[PDB]
C-alpha cells in the first residue's frame, strides 16, 4: 500500500479549476503519474484527465472501465511523448457545499478500485463552503485509501500524507488538459440535444424551444467558462511578458555585479 | 445600510492559489477589476425600508509582487517609487490587494492595517479591499489541507469582513429541453407553424441557430488552442530565463561567501580593583609542591560591570 | 511545545532572536513570569527540509495577565522584519513612530526582536491608559504616580472590558519597587538549569469598582527574595486603608521591605565574614561548608597525631546569638551507635567581634579544650 503522495502544482491547478467550474453537481477525473521509492513508497502525480459523468446524482461517483481504457491509452501516449513511466495512479472528485471527508460510498468505490491494485489512491476537493456567521470562504483537499474492517465487509477509510510539489511554471500537458473542459461541456450539451432529436416525430415550436435552450446553455458555458479561461490566459501572457522583462533586467544586473566584482 | 459584495472567477482564485503553492514563503500582490454601485432591487419588502446599496467588486486579474517589501518599509510607509512601480505594472483600475500567509489566524496584521490605510491614501481609493488567505494543514498527518480566505474593508477605522463569492457555471444554467410533444388537433396552428418553419428551422432538418452557436463555440475553442500555444511558448521562455537568473544568483552568493581566554577576567579585575597597592601580588596560581604563590599578568584592561560591595 | 523543544525546530537564521528573547525571560515586569512559545508552524512549502519553522505565537505575561501575540517571520527571507497580530485585542493602536527598533530593524543585533517587542509593550501600556482614562476617577491615582518617575516609569497598567451588567471596570497597577536587592544571596534549585530570574519585588494593586473602594494589594517576590526572607506565607503587608493614596501606600511597603532585606543581608554578610575568616585561617583542613547561606562549617584538625572534627553552626541571629561548636571523635561512637560528640555554646564570645578575633579565640578554645574532649572520648567511647 502507498505511503505518501506528491502532486505537481501544475496538475493541482487543473484539479482546482475543474472543482470551481460548477456547484450544482460533483465532478471527477483521473490522476496519471508514477510509483517511486525514496528515503518509503510514493506516488508522483504529473497530470490529470477530466471526465464527464453521465449518471450524476448525489454521492453516486464511479468511473467506467471504458474511461479506464481511454485513460490508459492517454497514459501510454504521454509516457512515449514525455518518456515518463506513466500509469493511472489515482482519481479525484469534488464535494461542493459538503465536508471534504469521503462518504462510505466514496470509500467502497476506493476499495473497488484497490481490488485492481492496493497502490491506488483517492483525492477529494471540498469547494466553496459558505458561512455568513464567520463571513469567510474556505477550500480543502485530502488524500485517502481504504482497508477491510475487522468485521464483515464495511470497509474503513485511512489517511495518506499528500504534499504539493512547487512546479514554478505551467507544463503544456496541463494547458492541453484545461482546454478539454469547454470541449467536454459542449459535447455533453450536444449529446443531450442529439438524444432529444431521436423522437423525430415531435412538435416544431417545441424544437424551436429546445434549440433556444441549447443556445442559452452554450451562451452560459461561454460566459462562465471559456470567456473567463481565455481572459486568464491573456492575463497570464501579460504577466509573463512583464516577468520576462524584470528577469532580463535582473540577469543584466547580476552579469554586471559578477563582471565588476571578482 | 450599505453592502459591498466581492466577486471572483474560479480561474482567478485557482491562479492565485497556484502562484502561492509555487512560492516557498508568504507572498502578496494586487487585485484589479471594476466596482459597480447597484441599488438593491428589493424582493418582498415594503414602501417603509431604506433600500440597501450593493457596491459589487468584480476581480478580473491579479498582479503578483515577486518580492516582499517591494513597495513598503518596516512601518508600512509606501515611499514614492512604489507608485511608479505599480504604474510600471501597466494597469487599468486597482480595486484591492491580496496576501498569502501560511499558518496564521484570519485577522489582518499590524503592518497590513497600516499598509492598507496608506495605500487607500496614496492611490486615492478609500474603498480598497484586502484579500487575506491562510493555507494550513490539519491532523498533523499532512493528509488534509485547508485554504481559508476572507475580504476586509475599513468602516469605523476598524476593518470588518466582507462576503466573497466565486462565479461558476452552476449559477442558474437551468437546462430545460421540453420533451413529450405539445401536439394540437388545430389545423390553423399546424398550418401557421408549418408555413413559418422554413424561416429558421432550415432545410433537410437541423436548425440554423444550433449551427451558428456551434460555429461560434468552435471559433472560441480554436482561439483557446492558439492562446494555449502562445502561453506555452511564453512559459518556456520564462523557465529558461528563470533557470539562468537562479544559476547566476547561486554563483553570486557562493562568490560572496568564499570571498569573505577561558580565564576568570571578572575575578581578576575585581581582585585588582579591591587591592590597589598594599600587597597586590594576589593571583589565581600557586606552587603545586609548597604553598607559595605564582604571579599572573591577567588582561588588567577589560571593561568591568556590576562592581559591588565585599561586606556591608 | 516547551522552549527546550521549540529552540530545536526554528529556522537557524531566526533561532538567535527567539533565543535572546526567551533567555532574557519576561518582557516588562510580567508578575506571573509564565513566558512561553505555543503554536509554531512552518510558514513555507511542506517539502522544505530540516529546521524550517518561523511563524509562532508568544504568551507575554503583563500586569498579572497574559497577552497572546502572533509573530511572523519568513525563513527564506530572514533579513526581513517581523509582522505582529495582537490576538482578539483589535482596538490596539500602536503608534509606529515610537518603534525605533522596528523603524531601524537590523538583524545585526540578535536582541532586535526583544527591543521591538519591549517597545511594543510600552505602547500597549499607554493604550491601556487610553481606555482607562474613559472610566475616570482612577486617573487621579495614575497621574499622581506618573509625577513620581522612580515609580511611574517602572510601571505597568491594565483595565478590563466593561461588565455586561452595571458597566463597571476592573483595573490593575503593577510597580517595580526601587530597593537594592543586589546583595540578596543565592540558593541552588533542584533542576539547576532553572533560572530564578532578575531579583526584583513587584507590587500589584487591583480595583473591582470604578471608585477607590474594595482594593486588593499583593506583593510578588522573585524566588531568591522569597527564599532569603523565609517564604511569602511568613510575611504580612499593610492592608489598603481606604480612599486614594497609592503615593502614600507604596513608600510604606518600600520602607518595610528595605528594613527586612537590610536585616537579613546584614546577617548573611556577617556569616560570610565569619566563614571567610575561618577559611583564611584553617582552610588547609576544611571538610565542608554551606557555600550558599554560610549557616554551617565542618573542619578536621589533628592534636598530637589524633584526628577530631569541629562543626560550627551559625544561628539566624548570628551577630547576637553565639555560634554552636560541636566536637566529634572520628574513632569513637556512643552506646546508641551514634557519633560520640560534645557541643559547646557557653564559651568566650562577644557579639562585637570581627571574623579574625573570633578565629583567634576559636583556635585558643581548641588548644585549651581538645585534651579534655579527647580524654573524655577515650574514657567513655568505644572503638
Ligand atoms: Zn465523494
| Complete DSSP assignment for C20-83 | HHHHH--SS--SS---EEEEEE--S-TT--SS-B-EEEEEEEETTEEEEEEEE--TT-TTS--E
Q: Which three cell numbers stand for residue C78?
A: 530572514
Nearest to C24 by CA among C127, C107, C114: C114
* Domain that residue A11 falls in: 4-165
CB of A257 within 8 A of CB of B254? no
CB contact under 8 A, B74 and C55: no
Query: Between vectors from CA B171 to CA B127 and to CA B41, what angle results, nearest 5°?
Result: 55
Whole-angstrom distance, CA of residue C188 vs CA of residue C292:
8
Pinpoint the alpha helices (H) of chain A: 9-19, 65-82, 104-114, 172-178, 180-196, 204-221, 227-260
Order across the sheet with C324-333: list the strands. Answer: C286-289, C296-303, C306-313, C324-333, C339-344
Nearest to B98 by CA among B200, B181, B15, B169: B15
Order across the sheet with C36-41: list the strands. Answer: C36-41, C55-62, C65-72, C83-85
Nearest to C329 by CA among C313, C346, C306: C306
Q: 3-state SS of chain A: helix, strand, coil percent to 5? A: 45, 25, 30
Nearest to C369 by CA among C341, C344, C333, C345: C344
Query: Between vectors from CA B140 to CA B134 and to CA B145, what angle results, nearest 5°?
Result: 40
Is C242 exposed, middle or buried (CB count within 10 Å of its CB: 0-12, 13-18, 19+)? exposed
CB of A124 within 8 A of CB of A142? yes
Q: Which three cell numbers stand for residue A153?
A: 465487509
A163 has a chain C CB within 8 A of its CB: yes
Q: Is B4 helix (H, G, I), strand (E, B) or coil?
A: coil
Strand partners, B144: A142, B138
End-to-end CA distance of chain C: 59
**Mutation for testing the B interface, residue in C1, C48, C72, C266 having most B CBs under 10 Å:** C72
Whole-angstrom distance, CA of residue A246 vs CA of residue B89:
11
Whole-angstrom distance, CA of residue C118 vs CA of residue C281:
50
Whole-angstrom distance, CA of residue C186 vs CA of residue B16:
59
Other CB atoms within 10 A of residue C362 CB: 23
End-to-end CA distance of chain A: 54
Nearest to C74 by CA among C105, C42, C100: C42
Q: What is the DSSP letter of C145?
A: H
Whole-angstrom distance, CA of residue C221 vs CA of residue C179:
12
Is A94 exposed, middle or buried (CB count within 10 Å of its CB: 0-12, 13-18, 19+)? buried
End-to-end CA distance of chain B: 74
CB of A58 within 8 A of CB of A194? no
CB of A26 within 8 A of CB of A109? no
Nearest to A182 by CA among A18, A13, A12: A18
CB of C10 within 8 A of CB of C53? yes
CATH of the domain at A23: 3.40.140.10
CB contact under 8 A, B101 and C43: yes
Gyration radius (Cα) of chain B, Å: 37
Can you spell out the DSSP letters for C291-314?
TTT--EEEEEEEETTEEEEEEEE-
**Ligand 1 centre distance from Cα of residue A107 (Å):** 8
Nearest to B68 among C42, C70, C74 (CB): C74
**What is the total residue count of chain C?**
383
CB of A114 within 8 A of CB of A82? no
Technique employed here was X-ray
What Cα–Cα distance (Å) separates residue C315 from each residue in C268, C271, C274?
Answer: 11, 9, 12
Whole-angstrom distance, CA of residue B50 vs CA of residue B46:
10
Other CB atoms within 10 A of residue C8 CB: 11
Query: Please, what sign has the CA dihedral across residues B267, B270, B271, B272?
Result: positive
CB of B19 within 8 A of CB of B131? no
CB contact under 8 A, B75 and C102: yes
Nearest CA in chain B to A158: B143
CB of A34 within 8 A of CB of A79? no
Whole-angstrom distance, CA of residue A137 vs CA of residue B165:
8
Query: Please, what sign has the CA dihedral across residues C18, C23, C25, C28?
Result: negative
**What is the total residue count of chain B?**
312
**Ligand 1 centre distance from Cα of residue A61 (Å):** 7
Q: Please report, to the nearest 10 degrees, the dihedral formed by the alpha carbons of residues B298, B300, B306, B312 taken in order.
A: 90
Whole-angstrom distance, CA of residue C16 vs CA of residue C35:
17
Whole-angstrom distance, CA of residue C249 vs CA of residue C237:
11
Whole-angstrom distance, CA of residue B148 vs CA of residue A137:
6
**Resolution for this experimental structure (Å):** 3.8
Other CB atoms within 10 A of residue A62 CB: 13
Amino acid at each position: 500500500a502507498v505511503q505518501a503522495v506528491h502532486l505537481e502544482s501544475d496538475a493541482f491547478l487543473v484539479c482546482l479549476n475543474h472543482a470551481l467550474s460548477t456547484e450544482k453537481e460533483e465532478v471527477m477525473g483521473l490522476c496519471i503519474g508514477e510509483l517511486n521509492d525514496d528515503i518509503i513508497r510514493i506516488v508522483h502525480i504529473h497530470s490529470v484527465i477530466i471526465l464527464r459523468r453521465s449518471d450524476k446524482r448525489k454521492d453516486r461517483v464511479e468511473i467506467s472501465p471504458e474511461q479506464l481504457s481511454a485513460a490508459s491509452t492517454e497514459a501510454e501516449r504521454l509516457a512515449e511523448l514525455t518518456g515518463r513511466p506513466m500509469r493511472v495512479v489515482g482519481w479525484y472528485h469534488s464535494h461542493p457545499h459538503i465536508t471534504v471527508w469521503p462518504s462510505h460510498v466514496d470509500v467502497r468505490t476506493q476499495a473497488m478500485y484497490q481490488m485492481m491494485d492496493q497502490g491506488f489512491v483517492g483525492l477529494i476537493f471540498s469547494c466553496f463552503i459558505e458561512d455568513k456567521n464567520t463571513k469567510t470562504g474556505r477550500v480543502l483537499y485530502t488524500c485517502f485509501q481504504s482497508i477491510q474492517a475487522q468485521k464483515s465487509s464495511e470497509y474503513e477509510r485511512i489517511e495518506i500524507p499528500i504534499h504539493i510539489v512547487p512546479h514554478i511554471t505551467i507544463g503544456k500537458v496541463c494547458l492541453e488538459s484545461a482546454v478539454e473542459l469547454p470541449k467536454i461541456l459542449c459535447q455533453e450539451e450536444q449529446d443531450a440535444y442529439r438524444r432529444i432529436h431521436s423522437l423525430t416525430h415531435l412538435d416544431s415550436v417545441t424544437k424551436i424551444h429546445n434549440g433556444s435552450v441549447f443556445t442559452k446553455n452554450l451562451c452560459s458555458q461561454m460566459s462562465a467558462v471559456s470567456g473567463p479561461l481565455l481572459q486568464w490566459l491573456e492575463d497570464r501572457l501579460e504577466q509573463n511578458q512583464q516577468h520576462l522583462q524584470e528577469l532580463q533586467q535582473e540577469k543584466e544586473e547580476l552579469m554586471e555585479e559578477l563582471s565588476s566584482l571578482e | 445600510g450599505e453592502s459591498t459584495l466581492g466577486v471572483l472567477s474560479g480561474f482567478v482564485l485557482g491562479a492565485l492559489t497556484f502562484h502561492h503553492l509555487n512560492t516557498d514563503s508568504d507572498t502578496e500582490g494586487f487585485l484589479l477589476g471594476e466596482m459597480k454601485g447597484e441599488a438593491k432591487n428589493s424582493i418582498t419588502d415594503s414602501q417603509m425600508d431604506n433600500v440597501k446599496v450593493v457596491y459589487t467588486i468584480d476581480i478580473q486579474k491579479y498582479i503578483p509582487c515577486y518580492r516582499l517589501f517591494s513597495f513598503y518599509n518596516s512601518l508600512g510607509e509606501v515611499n514614492e517609487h512604489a507608485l511608479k512601480k505599480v504604474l510600471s505594472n501597466v494597469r487599468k483600475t486597482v480595486v484591492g490587494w491580496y496576501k498569502f500567509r501560511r499558518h496564521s489566524d484570519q485577522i489582518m496584521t499590524f503592518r497590513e492595517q497600516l499598509l492598507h490605510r496608506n495605500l487607500q491614501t496614496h492611490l486615492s481609493s478609500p474603498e480598497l479591499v484586502f484579500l487575506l488567505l491562510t493555507p494550513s494543514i490539519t491532523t498533523e498527518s499532512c493528509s488534509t489541507h485547508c485554504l481559508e480566505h476572507a475580504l476586509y474593508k475599513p468602516q469605523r477605522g476598524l476593518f470588518h469582513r466582507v462576503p466573497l463569492v466565486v462565479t461558476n457555471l452552476g449559477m442558474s444554467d437551468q437546462l430545460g429541453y421540453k420533451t413529450e410533444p405539445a401536439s394540437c388537433t388545430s389545423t390553423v396552428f399546424s398550418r401557421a407553424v408549418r408555413t413559418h418553419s422554413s424561416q429558421f428551422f432550415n432545410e433537410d432538418g437541423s436548425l440554423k441557430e444550433v449551427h451558428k452557436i456551434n460555429e461560434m463555440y468552435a471559433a472560441v475553442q480554436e482561439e483557446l488552442k492558439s492562446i494555449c500555444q502562445k502561453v506555452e511558448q511564453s512559459e518556456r521562455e520564462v523557465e529558461k530565463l528563470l533557470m539562468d537568473v537562479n544559476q547566476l544568483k547561486e554563483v553570486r552568493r557562493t562568490q560572496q561567501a568564499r570571498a569573505t581566554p577561558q580565564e576568570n577576567i571578572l575575578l581578576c579585575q575585581a581582585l585588582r580593583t579591591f587591592f590597589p597597592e598594599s600587597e597586590v601580588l594576589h593571583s589565581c596560581v600557586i606552587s603545586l609542591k609548597n604553598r607559595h604563590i605564582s604571579p599572573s599578568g591577567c588582561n588588567v584592561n577589560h571593561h568591568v560591570d556590576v562592581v559591588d560591595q565585599l561586606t556591608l | 511545545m516547551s522552549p527546550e523543544i521549540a529552540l530545536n525546530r526554528i529556522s537557524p537564521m531566526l533561532s538567535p532572536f527567539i533565543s535572546s528573547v526567551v533567555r532574557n525571560g519576561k518582557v516588562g515586569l510580567d508578575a506571573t513570569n509564565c513566558l512561553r512559545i505555543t503554536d509554531l508552524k512552518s510558514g513555507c512549502t511542506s517539502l522544505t527540509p530540516g529546521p524550517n519553522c518561523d511563524r509562532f505565537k508568544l504568551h507575554i505575561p503583563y500586569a498579572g495577565e497574559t497577552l497572546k501575540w502572533d509573530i511572523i517571520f519568513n525563513a527564506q527571507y530572514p533579513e526581513l522584519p517581523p509582522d505582529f497580530i495582537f490576538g482578539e485585542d483589535a482596538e490596539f493602536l500602536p503608534d509606529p513612530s515610537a518603534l525605533h527598533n522596528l523603524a531601524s530593524w537590523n538583524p545585526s543585533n540578535p536582541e532586535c526582536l526583544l527591543l521591538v517587542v519591549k517597545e511594543l509593550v510600552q505602547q500597549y501600556h499607554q493604550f491601556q491608559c487610553g481606555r482607562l482614562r474613559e472610566s475616570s476617577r482612577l486617573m487621579f491615582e495614575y497621574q499622581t504616580l506618573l509625577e513620581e518617575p522612580q515609580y511611574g516609569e517602572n510601571m505597568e497598567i491594565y483595565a478590563g472590558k466593561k461588565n455586561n451588567w452595571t458597566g463597571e471596570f476592573s483595573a490593575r497597577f503593577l510597580l517595580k519597587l526601587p530597593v537594592d536587592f543586589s546583595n540578596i544571596p543565592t540558593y541552588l534549585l533542584k533542576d539547576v538549569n532553572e533560572d530564578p530570574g532578575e531579583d526584583v519585588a513587584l507590587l500589584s494593586v487591583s480595583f473591582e469598582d470604578t471608585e477607590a473602594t474594595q482594593v486588593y494589594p499583593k506583593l510578588y517576590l522573585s524566588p531568591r527574595i522569597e527564599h532569603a526572607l523565609g517564604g511569602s506565607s511568613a510575611l504580612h503587608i499593610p492592608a489598603f486603608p481606604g480612599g486614594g493614596c497609592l503615593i502614600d501606600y507604596v513608600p510604606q511597603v518600600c520602607h518595610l521591605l528595605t528594613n527586612k532585606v537590610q536585616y537579613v543581608i546584614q546577617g548573611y554578610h556577617k556569616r560570610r565574614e565569619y566563614i571567610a575568616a575561618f577559611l583564611s585561617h584553617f582552610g588547609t583542613g576544611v571538610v565542608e561548608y554551606d557555600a550558599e547561606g554560610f549557616t554551617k562549617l565542618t573542619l578536621l584538625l589533628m592534636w598530637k597525631d589524633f584526628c577530631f572534627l569541629v562543626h560550627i553552626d551559625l544561628p539566624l541571629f548570628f551577630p547576637r546569638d553565639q555560634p554552636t561548636l560541636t566536637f566529634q571523635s572520628v574513632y569513637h561512637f556512643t552506646n546508641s551507635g551514634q557519633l560520640y560528640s560534645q557541643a559547646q555554646k557557653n564559651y568566650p564570645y562577644s557579639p562585637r567581634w570581627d571574623g579574625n578575633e573570633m578565629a583567634k579565640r576559636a583556635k585558643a578554645y581548641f588548644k585549651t579544650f581538645v585534651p579534655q574532649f579527647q580524654e573524655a572520648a577515650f574514657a567513655n567511647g568505644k572503638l
